[PDB]
Amino acid sequence: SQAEFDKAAEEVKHLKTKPADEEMLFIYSHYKQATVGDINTERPGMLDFKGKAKWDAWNELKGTSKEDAMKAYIDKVEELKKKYGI
Numbered sequence: 001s002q003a004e005f006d007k008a009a010e011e012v013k014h015l016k017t018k019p020a021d022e023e024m025l026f027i028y029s030h031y032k033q034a035t036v037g038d039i040n041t042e043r044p045g046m047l048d049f050k051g052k053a054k055w056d057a058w059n060e061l062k063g064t065s066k067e068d069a070m071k072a073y074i075d076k077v078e079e080l081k082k083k084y085g086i
């Protein structure tokens, strides 16, 4: 009964396959909000698309609380569970 979400955040890494950057997109935003909180980082370095995708997706959430973030984060790591099959 902790950040089981943070446990999902492990699963999504174990998926037999680096999910599609677009599903990663969502996962990041909720993940990052839940673990970090209201984005204190900058827009893209070495991986533009990616860099913002994560930044941008999260940045979208800034203001939302860690747990709400979890609720959907988790449910979305859940999607990988199926998409890829962990």
Ligand SMILES: CCCCCCCCCCCCCCCC(=O)SCCNC(=O)CCNC(=O)[C@@H](O)C(C)(C)COP(=O)(O)OP(=O)(O)OC[C@H]1O[C@@H](n2cnc3c(N)ncnc32)[C@H](O)[C@@H]1OP(=O)(O)O
Residues within 6 Å of the ligand: 009, 010, 012, 013, 014, 017, 018, 019, 020, 021, 022, 023, 024, 025, 026, 027, 028, 029, 031, 032, 049, 050, 051, 053, 054, 055, 057
């Ligand atoms: C469209 C671009 C991504 C959308 C925004 C970020 C997505 C984050 C949510 C999903 C987490 C990644 C899911 C698995 C993806 C892969 O597997 S791709 C890497 C090759 N690895 C594998 O196949 C095995 C598992 N992978 C890994 O352990 C890492 O390489 C990992 C995927 C976690 C990170 O690699 P990658 O996505 O290629 O680039 P990063 O910039 O290093 O990470 C993406 C962003 O997500 C944050 N992050 C790191 N680890 C996680 C986990 N476990 N869950 C969720 N989010 C994670 C990073 O902080 C990074 O964003 P930023 O902070 O902006 O750089």
